[PDB]
Structures are given as C-alpha cells and as structure tokens.
Amino acid sequence: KMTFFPYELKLRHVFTVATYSRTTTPDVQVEIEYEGVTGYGEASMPPYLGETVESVMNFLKKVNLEQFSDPFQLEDILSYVDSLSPKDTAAKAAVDIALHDLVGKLLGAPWYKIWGLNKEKTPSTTFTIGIDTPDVVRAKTKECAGLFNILKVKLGRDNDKEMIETIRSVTDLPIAVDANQGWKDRQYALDMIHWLKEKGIVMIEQPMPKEQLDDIAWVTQQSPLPVFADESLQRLGDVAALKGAFTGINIKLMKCTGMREAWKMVTLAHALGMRVMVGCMTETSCAISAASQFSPAVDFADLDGNLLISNDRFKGVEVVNGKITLNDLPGIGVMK
C-alpha cells in the first residue's frame, strides 16, 4: 500500500542555483507498507528542474503497486513504474527509494551491505560557501571551516576569481567547483581550470553548457583537474555518450529515478573507465541517506542536502570528521 503527501521543505537560508534563488523546495513524501513494514521514499522538486507538487502527485496516482505481490521483484516493479510516463524522474525516484527501504527492512540489512560495499570507505561531503559580500564570505567560510574536509563553490558568475581568492585567504581546504554550464568560452574555461588548480581546487563540474559537448571534450583532454558531467546527463542511457568528453559523471537520485538505476550508472561509468560522484537536491534525510548507501563507491560527494533544511523528518546518515557516516539501520538507513 503506497501513500503520499506534499511536504514543502523550508530552507535555512537563501539557496542559489545559477540564476535561481529560493528559500523553500516543493517535495513529496512517500510511504509503502507491506505486512507491517514501512519503506520511506521522497521526491524533491527544485523548481527549475520541471517537476511540481502537482506533477509528482499526479504521477504517483497512476502507480498501482497493489497488483504486485512481491516487493523483492524490483526489476519488474520499477520497469512498470518507469513505463507510466516518459520522464517524472523525481516522482519515480520516490517510489524506488521507498521500495528499497522496504526491501532492505524485509532483508534486515542496509543497501551498502547488500551491494557489498565497505561503509568505512564513505567519502567526505562538500559543504557550500555561498556568494555574498567578501566579509560575509570569509565569515561563513570560517564558521564551517572546521567541520568539513572539502568545500564547494559555485562559479560561472561574475566574481569567480574574487570569490576563490576570498575563501582561500581564510582556509587551506581543498575546493570543488561547479560552474553549472556557466562558461560559454572554451579557452576561458581551460584557462580558469588551470588557475583554479593553482588555487587548490581539486575537481571541476560541468564547466560549459551541455550543448557544447565538443568544447567540453577539448577542455577535459587538456585539464589538470578531473571534469565531471552533471547537467550533461540524467539517466543510465545518457552515460555512454559522455565517455571521452568527461572524466566522470555526477549521479543524483531525483534525476535518475532512484537507487536501482543509480547503482547501474555507477557500474556502467566504472566499467567504461569513468569516475563517479554523487550529488543531491535540498532533501530530507530520507533521500540523502538513500544516496549515501552507494557513496563508498564514489570519488566525490555533495550530500549535505538535509543540513540545508529546517524541517527534516528523519535521522539518518550523519557527518563525522567531515565524512558521510552510514549507520547500521536496514533499508536506506533512517529512523522517522
């Protein structure tokens, strides 16, 4: 039995993505009950990604899980779920996450264990230093520069260099940058990458628009830093085409339809010699913990979504010594 309801996330501070800022995030919480056991799922919908409370609720209303007598047949169930519409990946991810939580609970094990991973190999998660006045930047950098091992900075703006210089003036932590399709000029992108490398940046994400794949490959082939694809891909079927253009791929549950496809993407990327990183949207600990289950296999992780909201409903993965830390709870590892 699947039930679901809207649960708007309240952000602690203004959150900015490219040219979009917000203080809330539409979200739908999902639950799947089977023989007294309940699996928790979630759909998070950053406005610019094209899904809404209406689209997600409408999609979930099309899903009939009652006709399935065995929660363990995830291949069949999720194939059916995917067939209900061409996209709606966040809505589909919510069903996938709840099903994995349910199945893990039925098996009495966390997915990192079912997948055969070593939880001690979880990565450090980045935490973002937001754009603001040089004084506010140095302040916030200092405030969190003590809990994390790596910092994230979103570039592609107008004061990128000043921002990096400001941050680097009060901390020596490595920095991961996400240009989010911000650099349209190929030479600028490469020149900036070399400058960032000199400033201690250790990874760059989506330097240019996804439409300029040839330019991206040109940059990556000469880049001293690993270049990860984000906006350039969404699902499993988008991975292969990026080989040779990117060093690795970024996987997000809300973009790929959940844990099952996410794990297939990790397998595919690796089998193809590409690296993998995992990201997130502003989410409750439900989706964050779910994604964390395969973090022992990634090179980089931006899994701080729940720290950005003031109304988390679950206690799941925690950040210890700046490291994503999985508990021993079965399923996706959360307690309501």
Residue numbers in the known binding site for Mg(2+) are: 178, 205, 230
Examine residue 315 and tell whether it contacts a copy of itself (CB under 8 A).
no
User: Which listed residue (54, 267, 328, 336) binds a copy of itself by CB under 8 A?
Assistant: 267
Closest CA to 254 of 262, 246, 263: 262
Shortest distance, position 266 Cβ to a copy of itself, whole Å: 10
In terms of residues, how long is the chain? Answer: 336
Q: What angle do CA 226, 302, 221 make, to 5 degrees?
A: 10
Q: Specify whether the CB–CB gap between 282 and 311 falls below 8 A.
A: no
CA distance 101 to 286: 9
Examine residue 298 and tell whether it contacts a copy of itself (CB under 8 A).
no
Which of 168/235 has CB closer to a copy of itself?
235
Shortest distance, position 246 Cβ to Mg ion, whole Å: 12
Collect all residues with Cβ–Cβ distance below 8 Å to 149 and sequence separation of at least 6. Answer: 124, 173, 174, 321, 322, 323
Per-residue mark of binding to a copy of itself, 228-247 (x: CB under 8 A): --------xx-xx-------
Which of 80/218 has CB closer to a copy of itself?
80
CA distance 152 to 142: 14
Give, for 58, the enclosing helix (H) or strand (E): helix 53-60
Shortest distance, position 77 Cβ to a copy of itself, whole Å: 8
CA distance 327 to 336: 14
Q: Could you say which of a copy of itself, Mg ion, none residue 107 binds, taking C-beta under 5 to 8 angstroms by partner kind?
A: a copy of itself
Which of 31/178 has CB closer to Mg ion?
178
Q: Specify whether the CB–CB gap between 30 and 332 falls below 8 A.
A: no
Size of the site for a copy of itself (CB under 8 A): 27
SS3 187: helix
- Site residues (CB under 5 A) for Mg ion? 178, 205, 230
User: Which listed residue (36, 86, 108, 146) binds a copy of itself by CB under 8 A?
Assistant: 108
Q: Could you say which of a copy of itself, Mg ion, none residue 205 binds, taking C-beta under 5 to 8 angstroms by partner kind?
A: Mg ion
CA distance 233 to 239: 7
> Using CB under 8 A, which of the segments 6-14, 20-28, 116-124, 246-254 binds a copy of itself?
116-124
Examine residue 221 and tell whether it contacts a copy of itself (CB under 8 A).
no
SS3 223: coil
Q: Could you say which of Mg ion, a copy of itself, none residue 178 binds, taking C-beta under 5 to 8 angstroms by partner kind?
A: Mg ion
User: Which listed residue (297, 301, 332, 334) binds a copy of itself by CB under 8 A?
Assistant: 297
Residues of the binding site for substrate: 22, 48, 152-154, 252, 280-282, 302-304
Examine residue 14 and tell whether it contacts a copy of itself (CB under 8 A).
no
19-78 residues in contact with a copy of itself (CB under 8 A) are 72-76
Per the DSSP assignment, residues forming a β-bridge with 300 are 277
Identity of residue 312 = D
Closest CA to 154 of 170, 177, 173, 134: 177
Which of 63/163 has CB closer to a copy of itself?
63
What would the two tokens of residue 252 be? Answer: 């997000």
Shortest distance, position 99 Cβ to a copy of itself, whole Å: 9
* CB under 8 A, 24+ apart: contacts of 190-196: 190/218, 190/219, 190/222, 190/223, 192/155, 192/160, 193/219, 193/223, 193/224, 193/225, 193/227, 194/224, 195/161, 196/164, 196/225
Which of 16/73 has CB closer to a copy of itself?
73
SS3 14: strand
Closest CA to 210 of 235, 232, 240: 232
Examine residue 213 and tell whether it contacts a copy of itself (CB under 8 A).
no
Shortest distance, position 230 Cβ to a copy of itself, whole Å: 19
How many of the other CB atoms lie within 10 Å of CB of 221?
A: 11
Positions in the binding site for a copy of itself (CB under 8 A): 72-76, 103, 107-109, 113-118, 236-237, 239-240, 260, 264, 267-268, 271-272, 296-297
